[PDB]
Design a protein around this nucleic acid. Structure first.
Ligand SMILES: Nc1ncnc2c1ncn2[C@H]1C[C@H](O)[C@@H](COP(=O)(O)OP(=O)(O)C(Br)(Br)P(=O)(O)O)O1
Ligand SMILES: [Cl-]
Ligand SMILES: [Cl-]
Ligand SMILES: [Mg+2]
Ligand code: NA
Ligand code: NA
Ligand code: NA
Length: 326
DNA sequence: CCGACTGCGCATCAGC
DNA sequence: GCTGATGCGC
DNA sequence: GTCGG
């Protein structure tokens, strides 16, 4: 990667602002600058050259100059030496522990994996599962395992009702050679924007995946969104596979294209594309694209027959999933 | 100079 | 219980 | 932290 030193710096700065400063717009500004620099096809020689790119302003250009001259950023060197920042950043690596809870735990003297492990009763259910699988959730998933997981999920969904359609999205659908988790978009003709003619549509699928011991834990679960934990089966004498995060999102079948656009991402790609829609007078979510009136009020959903239709409304050339990894 | 920054489901809690 | 934040992770 | 008007 051509500018990895710079993008790593900006990412660590983004994480500092989110986790410690609790400054969500600085976090997003740093992530935006990292993303645009990551796609820039030249090795950056100067902060001024970087400042040409949209999202790199004066302050990041200065940081880039410092990094290029010295190989480091004093601001980050000091953050790394600060105990409270160090503790908060570590605690937020547990799934379910965010900026707020991390800072509250540090106040209470809970500041290490050992402290968490002996204070399990101070964790909510999500945090408790996050701690249990702390090590596993740091491991990435090779695409070859994602293919096995996909096969299980699709076949088990088929056994519940052959009219379900499950689509693995996320980085997998963008063609990545490894993924951080598995994201599954689910549809069924009974659930549309017009009516829900069968209950428990998501529950049935989760239950079947639990039945065959693929889903092992639940982080949260409602009528349309499941977040939990899964594990591939292993063979005789073989070490067990790590536990993996799995998300399942049930979307109205007639809104599949907005939903698969959303769940394919990346997150920054969605953010960039939704920001462009707003400039063009539309708002995009995982359900619909709608015009915005002058009052800022969204209007009726526009018809959508493909992912490209959504690109067309906002006057973007279509981008294949493999080219949305921003 | 400064308002606006993508969008939302599920968990948790406060106030009534 | 309901309603409306706030937190969190997508 | 960045940027459009
Ligand atoms: N804040 C956000 N805003 C808009 N869309 C978002 C979003 N967060 C997530 N999405 C959309 C967009 C996103 O692609 C999808 C899945 O969210 P994952 O967190 O699983 O992201 P992924 O791409 O699968 C990665 Br590379 Br992080 P992996 O999980 O393989 O490590 O939900
Ligand atoms: Cl901010
Ligand atoms: Cl909508
Ligand atoms: Mg994912
Ligand atoms: Na710029
Ligand atoms: Na966390
Ligand atoms: Na996910």
């Amino acid at each position: 990667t051509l500018n990895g030193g710079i993008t790593d710096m900006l990412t660590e700065l983004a994480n500092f602002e989110k986790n410690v400063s609790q400054a969500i717009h600085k976090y997003n500004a740093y992530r935006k600058a990292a993303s645009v620099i990551a796609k820039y096809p030249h090795k950056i020689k100067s902060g001024a050259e970087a400042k040409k790119l949209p999202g790199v302003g004066t302050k990041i250009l200065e940081k880039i100059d410092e990094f290029l001259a010295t190989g480091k950023l004093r601001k980050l060197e000091k953050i790394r030496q600060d105990d409270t920042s160090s503790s908060i950043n570590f605690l937020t690596r547990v799934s379910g522990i965010g900026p707020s809870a991390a800072r509250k735990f540090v106040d209470e003297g809970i500041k290490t994996l050992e402290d968490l492990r002996k204070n399990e009763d101070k964790l909510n259910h999500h945090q408790r599962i996050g701690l249990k699988y702390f090590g596993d959730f740091e491991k990435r998933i090779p695409r070859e395992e994602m293919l096995q997981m996909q096969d299980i999920v699709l076949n088990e969904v088929k056994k519940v009702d052959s009219e379900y359609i499950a689509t693995v999205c996320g980085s997998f659908r963008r063609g990545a050679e490894s993924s951080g988790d598995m994201d599954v978009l689910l549809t069924h003709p009974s659930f549309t924007s017009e009516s829900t003619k069968q209950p428990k549509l998501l529950h049935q699928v989760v239950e079947q995946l639990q039945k065959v011991h693929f889903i092992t834990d639940t982080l949260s679960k409602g009528e349309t969104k499941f977040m939990g934990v899964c594990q591939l089966p292993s063979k005789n004498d073989e070490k067990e596979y790590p536990h993996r995060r799995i998300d399942i999102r049930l979307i109205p079948k007639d809104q599949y294209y907005c939903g698969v656009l959303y769940f394919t991402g990346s997150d920054i790609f969605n953010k960039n594309m939704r920001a462009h829609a707003l400039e063009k007078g539309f708002t995009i979510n995982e359900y619909t694209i709608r015009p915005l009136g002058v009052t800022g009020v969204a209007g009726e959903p526009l018809p959508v027959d493909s992912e490209k239709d959504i690109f067309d409304y906002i006057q973007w050339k279509y981008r294949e999933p493999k080219d949305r990894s921003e």
